[model samples]
Target: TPVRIYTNAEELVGKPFRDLGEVSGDSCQASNQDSPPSIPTARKRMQINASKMKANAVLLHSCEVTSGTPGCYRQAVCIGSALNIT
Candidate 1:
């Protein structure tokens, strides 16, 4: 099943989850299942891992670059969490 992922906690309402562990995408596929413009590789990577972790949503902290070079690409990571309705 696909989870309802988010980059911010403000998107959620009626929050009652017990706060979960952090999930980091250490490696983003250079050519992943999804691509640019539409689905960023970084996000796709997080979605893949989050699904495995059964995370209902993710609070994104930062997207960091892999190198010191200007053309280097960044990777995405976030804190995973579950949710409940009001």
Candidate 2:
């Protein structure tokens, strides 16, 4: 089964938020593109989408390159307030 995300247009307005994702890697940049690179999983997609819906904002989460490289995890978050929709 998969997670379902929903948004309340009336509950979101004039709010600010931030989104986040996980990190992962398989090989170095010099590696062949066909070497099988890691990509965003379904879990990550659901999480990020849910966050956006909750925040009433649509934006891509920042990538984690702490390992001196690019990667993504399977999680996300959003911070904001609710507003009346008209």
Candidate 3:
């Protein structure tokens, strides 16, 4: 199923839903010469991650950048909660 994503917790208020724990997605530039990391790419990955969890939606907590990491020079990481919603 396609996943719907929310950036604000309030968006899911007054809606019927089930929590499926937390989920996170990441997009990174492995090489310094590569293009900068993308938030949209990270969010898209978050959707896929949620889908694998049998979640139809996500309540986004944060989308932020990462650096000084071993695997990535720069990364966009999106964190959120997976949800099953009506």
Q: Give the candidate number with the greatest lDDT.
A: 3
Top candidate on TM-score is 3
For candidate 3, give the lDDT.
0.89
TM-score for predicted model 3 compared with the true structure: 0.91
Mind giving the per-residue lDDT tens digits that candidate 3 earns over 2-58? Answer: 899988978887998999988888888998999999888899888889989999899
Clashes of each: 0, 7, 0
lDDT over C-alpha atoms for residue 26 of model 2: 31
Model 1 steric clash total: 0
Model 2 TM-score (2 dp): 0.21
Q: What do the candidate models score in CA lDDT, each in turn?
A: 0.50, 0.32, 0.89
lDDT of 2: 0.32
Stretches of candidate 2 off by over 4 Å are: 1-37, 42-57, 68-86
The alpha-carbon deviation from the true structure for residue 46 of candidate 1, after best TM-score superposition, in angstroms, is 1.4
Off-target runs (Cα >4 Å) in candidate 3 are none
Report clash pairs, candidate 3.
Answer: none
Q: Considering TM-score, which of the candidate structures 1 and 2 is the better prediction for this target?
A: 1
